[PDB]
Design a protein around this ligand. Structure first.
Ligand code: HEM
Length: 154
């Protein structure tokens, strides 16, 4: 798939707002993902034990990882499709070390879209959401193709 420049602009305009508070968006997203699909929490051996949203909100570690995650995702979006290099190390660790099924990447894509919609309704109308969705489908498709070359296709 190929996004047009206008779609990338809609994606990088709402991402510039996310970058005004990387840690808070990172937290929101991971929590939304763990509340919505609790099974994904089990993948994190470092967070697994957290029992409530209040415990999640108070975890410094979780908030630090959320920054790591968004930083990595942001560097991929700013490439505007030319992300081959960035994707390599990410696909290798999630497919071989962490073992993250494609289905989970769909779950966190849904969490990202929920959170932008709640925080940024004025910059995340229907067209901007269809473009973000197009950009995350691209990402998932390329990661899935790499998973396959690596021997996991999960
Ligand atoms: C937007 C999608 C994703 C991005 C950009 C992303 C990015 C990262 C980054 C940059 C790291 C650290 C370096 C490395 O291990 O590669 C990381 C680690 C990790 N990620 Fe992801 N990730 C994504 C989705 C997921 C999902 C959906 C899960 C699981 C439900 C997952 C589970 C983990 C785990 C288990 C670690 C290790 C955490 C720790 O250090 O103990 N990732 N991910």
């Amino acid at each position: 798939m190929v996004l047009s420049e206008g779609e990338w602009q809609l994606v990088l305009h709402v991402w510039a707002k996310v970058e005004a508070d990387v840690a808070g968006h990172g937290q929101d997203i991971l929590i939304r993902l763990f509340k919505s699909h609790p099974e994904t929490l089990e993948k994190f051996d470092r967070f697994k034990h957290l029992k409530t949203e209040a415990e999640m909100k108070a975890s410094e570690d979780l908030k630090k990882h959320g920054v790591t995650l968004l930083t990595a995702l942001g560097a991929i979006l700013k490439k505007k499709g030319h992300h081959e290099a960035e994707l390599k190390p990410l696909a290798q660790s999630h497919a071989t070390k962490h073992k993250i099924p494609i289905k989970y990447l769909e779950f966190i894509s849904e969490a990202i879209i929920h959170v932008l919609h709640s925080r940024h309704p004025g910059n995340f109308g229907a067209d901007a959401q269809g473009a973000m969705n197009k950009a995350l489908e691209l990402f998932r498709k390329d990661i899935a193709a790499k998973y396959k070359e690596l021997g996991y296709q999960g």
